[PDB]
Amino acid sequence: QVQLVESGLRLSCAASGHTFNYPIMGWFRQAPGKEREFVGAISWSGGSTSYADSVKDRFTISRDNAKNTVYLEMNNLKPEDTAVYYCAAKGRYSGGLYYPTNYDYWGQGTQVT
């Protein structure tokens, strides 16, 4: 079991428990009228980030295993970035990186305007 704690512009996702069984953390945002949208993903150990097109070169993701945290730094905001943000954990053999169905443990929703 993995416990995700959301804080936070900069959003912090701090995970505790069995972070070895869920080696990938991903970020999603839900618009009021749209479905959940993938933002980016970070590997706990490899530090190999992946980003969606709409937030390339603007959002950045970093990981530190000292206290098991992943940071999403948002820069050059736009009015089309007003969505409730979620952080999630992905299993080792869970499939595609861009689909919310494949993520098991979801954090608390965080609002950004």
Add this chain to the structure above:
Amino acid sequence: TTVFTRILDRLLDGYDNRLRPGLGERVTEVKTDIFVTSFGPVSDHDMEYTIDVFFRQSWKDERLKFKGPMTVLRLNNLMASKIWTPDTFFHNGKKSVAHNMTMPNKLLRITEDGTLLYTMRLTVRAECPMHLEDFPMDAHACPLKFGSYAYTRAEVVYEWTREPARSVVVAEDGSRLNQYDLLGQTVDSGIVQSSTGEYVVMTTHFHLKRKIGYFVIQTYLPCIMTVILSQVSFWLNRESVPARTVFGVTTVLTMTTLSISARNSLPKVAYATAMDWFIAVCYAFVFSALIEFATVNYFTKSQPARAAKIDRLSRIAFPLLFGIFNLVYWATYLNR
């Protein structure tokens, strides 16, 4: 020669090899027998053994009765693929080989009453779960179990061709064991139960006993010599402090090296073997000899008479106790 071709064509005319003989009318009975041509090496690390066999099966198929100038047709083995054969498999097999050089190592013979003899040459790797508490004086019963994969006991049964003790025959020169000694085999049959039904199983247990000479000249003798060397220190005069210290430390180092090297061909079992107990006791003797020297040196310059008495007592006590321990240990383990 045309007569035999016509006979074979008539035998195969309308034959359906998807159906066992006697389907819906009676159980198919298969008589099996094994000729071991070589009982190959045993692997303690993998808990397995290799065996090379002629595997022989025989059964009745009324669809193949014929009448001709001969009573037995000894056919090319390709015919085996045109008829029905039993689907025998080894339950504890790991990775077997059916030899194909220079041709498939199979033979098929048909008797005019419809009896089929079907023989193949196989190399079977099989699991032998071993308990190594008595190592290196352990004995094992390595099993070999086989039976039908798809046919329950209501469809196919297996029987040994002759008396069960005489249906598994080991070749007289067919022994590739280097570390073990084959004492005999026990032959049996029974019923297994699984989620797909009840099946017949034929079982052979080979009884192996490990030869001890290698471990005698590899571990026991160096340990004994190290213990004797450590007890030799009791006869050096008490002034020779560096010499007796060198004796003690070197013997402790030798015991540690021998203890570490002892487990090199064994699986990482979680329990202690007999050799481990022997090495632990030898290590205890060497360490206690060093402690004896330390005690003697502590009292040397204050109670020299007590130190001399302790040394004289030790010169007798240490060898006597080591000999008694050796007698007890070897009596316990060689008579089991």
Add this chain to the structure above:
Amino acid sequence: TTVFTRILDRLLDGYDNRLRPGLGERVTEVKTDIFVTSFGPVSDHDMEYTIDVFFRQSWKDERLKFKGPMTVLRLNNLMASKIWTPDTFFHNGKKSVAHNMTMPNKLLRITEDGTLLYTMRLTVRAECPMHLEDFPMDAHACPLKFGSYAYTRAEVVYEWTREPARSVVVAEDGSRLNQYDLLGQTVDSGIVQSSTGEYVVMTTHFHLKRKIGYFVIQTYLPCIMTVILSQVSFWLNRESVPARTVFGVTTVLTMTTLSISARNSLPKVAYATAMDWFIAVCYAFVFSALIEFATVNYFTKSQPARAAKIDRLSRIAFPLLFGIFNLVYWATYLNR
């Protein structure tokens, strides 16, 4: 498209692939060439090497003439299994692989005049007998020989596509060699006679030269430094008996460990390499230094002047003799 389908169906109508082109009339001439995409590792222990090639063969088959809109049909390699091809094999091959991922790595092209080009991608492991008397300063000529298995010189002959030097082409960056340099290759052809007749054989020798840097920094430098360290002992004063004893003991032990460990890589050949001679001479020097110390110690207390004279002479004699030995050894083994 249907035109080409009809052409292919007419070519394969009444075509017997059991018969070579020109059977009973003349000799089939096969032109061959090799493109080495990678010259894989060389193994001294197994006396073999690995090579990755595009193997290209070309011949003429009158039965495959056609007339159509295209001049060359570049066909799916399945077609290659429906026509005659040469039965070329590598005489000194050990176990080769015809690559099959994701499809058979084969190509067939048919020209309208009946000319066939047939290419395949192969990994060949071949035997290279090595004479290791000069190891690690040795050079080898690894051969690769191929030819027809079943067709004698009266039925099939092999020729190089272009001039023999230009027919085997090695890629620029296709070296997987670690401890060797590929100096070049020679190309030749000839006849070999066996129990079944005379056969054409095509041979390519690759010339390899071992690099020495690894052994320079792995064996020669530690040995030289150990010898110099042992000869350092001659300069300590005669009062420091424990120091010189420690010097001798530790240098002899280091030389013994190096000598024992230095033959791990090589096969157990029944002769002495150059490295063996170097290590033997270094061992002799260290042992002679220890013997000299023992001699000096024996005469130390009774004839101190003789011990001093021996030490003074040895301090000059030993480095000079080691230098002369090194010069002889390197002159012998470098201008070979």
Add this chain to the structure above:
Amino acid sequence: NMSFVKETVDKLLKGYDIRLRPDFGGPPVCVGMNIDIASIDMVSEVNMDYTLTMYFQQYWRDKRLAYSGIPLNLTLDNRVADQLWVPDTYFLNDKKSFVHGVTVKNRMIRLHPDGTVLYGLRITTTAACMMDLRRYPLDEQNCTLEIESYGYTTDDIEFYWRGGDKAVTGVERIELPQFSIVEHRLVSRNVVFATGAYPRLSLSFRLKRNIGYFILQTYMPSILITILSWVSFWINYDASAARVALGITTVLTMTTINTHLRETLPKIPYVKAIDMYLMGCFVFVFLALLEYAFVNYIFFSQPARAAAIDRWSRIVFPFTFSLFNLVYWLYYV
């Protein structure tokens, strides 16, 4: 009457198209799974994988194979499997698998009157299992087997464990040398790739490592050598050769033990518990050697202070070693 059975089986396979799934173009075909674990042979930290042998049974329904007039299960020769449709089941985390083929292919085909097909295989598979060795050898691992359809999406095929938690048998009989199976779990879910959603069955085991082998094999020699190093503190300070011999011998034995230990593990970049213990022991023996070096250095002019240092070292080293052992065994247990 075998002729009627033959005619019925010929009729069932007349016009049968194996390229099409049952109920092609309609609702998904449901496939139930069962596994009997025969053995779990070897668990490798070096290769990060484990080997497993099993009887794998798939049950489904194919209405093209329904027959009447024969009140029997029809067990057919396994080569009939080449003339029927079967699911395209594979194992996602496997590295090398094979079906046993002695004496024949270890395959079973059983038809039922209503069209139900039972398809059984005996499979030995090596499967990847990433391991966390930060607490080695006091670690606990979770090794899984992932079972998926390759070509068919969830609109064509569905998986389910046949019998619920009873669908996997034989786990309680498994005996492992280095491990014990604490628990096994069965999961069913869906996995989305770029080409669609696919059914997924997961079978997981939790393995706890036994500690006895490492107590007997590496911890005891290190402890005994460290204790041996303390005998020097009880030897007089003027026996220089003996105590220098002790220091050199202890350092050499520590290096040999460390090399023999590390020659059996992968080159992981973090510190393991056994590495921590061994370098603690190395620090202790090195400190004992350096303490003797200091005492030998200063004892020529201050014999009393050297004797006092030796006497206090007789006590300090056992106390600090006991404290280090306490801290180590409290941090990892």
Add this chain to the structure above:
Amino acid sequence: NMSFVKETVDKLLKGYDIRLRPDFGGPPVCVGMNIDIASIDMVSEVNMDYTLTMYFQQYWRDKRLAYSGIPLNLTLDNRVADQLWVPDTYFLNDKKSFVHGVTVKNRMIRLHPDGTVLYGLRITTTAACMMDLRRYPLDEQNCTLEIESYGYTTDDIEFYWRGGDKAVTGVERIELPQFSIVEHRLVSRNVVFATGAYPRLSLSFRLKRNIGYFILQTYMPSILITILSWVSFWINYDASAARVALGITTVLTMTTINTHLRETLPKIPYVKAIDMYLMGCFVFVFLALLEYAFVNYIFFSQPARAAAIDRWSRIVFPFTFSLFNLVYWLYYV
């Protein structure tokens, strides 16, 4: 209706010549590639290769396979792939590859109404990767996969990454203990052989080696032995036994480290960074021992000169060692 689809597929395969590529005799057929990386099992310097497992997807259009009346994409049993034309794609630098075949051959065929074929394989390949070890263990490697067409030249076939930069996924699934992935790159080009010009796709990864293990297990022992070797400079030159023991111990320990540690790599001829470091430390300890030998040789007739030599060595040796370390770590980092 299953019979309608059956006759549609029978009509599709009727008169189909598998020996001919789509648009044979006309414009080249375009093949789009996708790769989904499952894992990289191992990277071996001794064998100079690496093992990769992947889903390899190929996309093309064959007008002979177009069908109408069914507004659906036909996912067919993979055995039908034996009756269709497929590209003769191969990997140039691979050494041993197989398609997984449990429970069936891991292969996928999906047809589309306009004639588009999607063809998927699950492949494990051991591919060659020549490594430059001059900066080892601080080295950075570049390992590639070369995808090419064997028989068809650029007149017959074209390759392109389907989706551009997004044609390869799953890079974050690569978990190597000894390496980390820094970057991956996709390349498309043509290669000219004596038989013509062929399309070539290239997928490259840049691997960075983690330094922690080598810092922990190699550099620290050498630094500590050199520092221990410097203690002789601070000891009075009358203690011949102690200083000789120190020098001999340091020399022999350096040799033991080198022999028991370097014997683990391919027999490359050049010098690596770790080799140069170990040889420098050996040179330093040997020079300290030789300096003491000379001082002991001369101190009985020129004690003041010997004291001055020791006094200057005390300062010079740490300074030159610091300069050596500075140069080494600047050059290699």
Add this chain to the structure above:
Amino acid sequence: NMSFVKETVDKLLKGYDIRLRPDFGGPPVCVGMNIDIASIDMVSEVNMDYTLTMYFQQYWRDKRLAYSGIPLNLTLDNRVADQLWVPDTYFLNDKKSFVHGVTVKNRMIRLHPDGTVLYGLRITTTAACMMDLRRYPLDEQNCTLEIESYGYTTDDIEFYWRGGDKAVTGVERIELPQFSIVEHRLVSRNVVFATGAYPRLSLSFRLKRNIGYFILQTYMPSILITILSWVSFWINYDASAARVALGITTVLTMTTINTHLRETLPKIPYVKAIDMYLMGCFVFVFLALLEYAFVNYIFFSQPARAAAIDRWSRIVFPFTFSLFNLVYWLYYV
């Protein structure tokens, strides 16, 4: 005239029944055999086997294949072997074998006008060879290849060596690093099993091991350490630490040599010659150490007796070692 040859070949295979041997129902068919040995690879004592590469040629007559009007011997495509009858020859003592298959299957079929078939294969086989290692490394082995018919008894088939004692070629050109082939022998016999009597051919080689490697590698260090152990008798008896160090070092080094050497061979239960030599050397060094211990025990009250014991040891130990070497090398040579 390829048309006429094709007609003849098609006529030959028209009514051919591959299921029946030639002269089925009549006298046994005679099969002559030849072998051309190309190489003998690794002869392993650990695995108790050897590897052989050879050209295996079989010769027989099938009157069903006779043809007229074509004055040529017809070499055919090797795949025609799949339509003719061939003997079911196998090797009894083979563990793993294969026919080479690059570029094609290494197989030859050559027909003759009278119906004679020549059938050739190129085969690599690993064959079991149990070795008696009691005299190792001065041992002589005998390794065989057993060629037999599997299904056909002596009333259906009979083997013979074609060409008498010249049926095997290439023995004199084999190069083995560790052995030399002294002799080879050919035998023909019958073997009875429960299913009948079968023909058996045996090809045996006698291999003699070369001793130079073992002189360089094992005996010389033991001799040098034994001689080194005698240096103690020439060092004055008051130097206790030096002589005890020398004796202990020699003893421990001999034990280390023995343990290191015995682990490169299979775990046989008996004693080999090198084991006896090493045990004798251990006995000698142990007795030298015991002699020193006894001298140390009685050199206070009786120094002259101790000096005499050392002086007599100086002569007795070399003499007894010489006698032991003489006895050993006379027994084993």
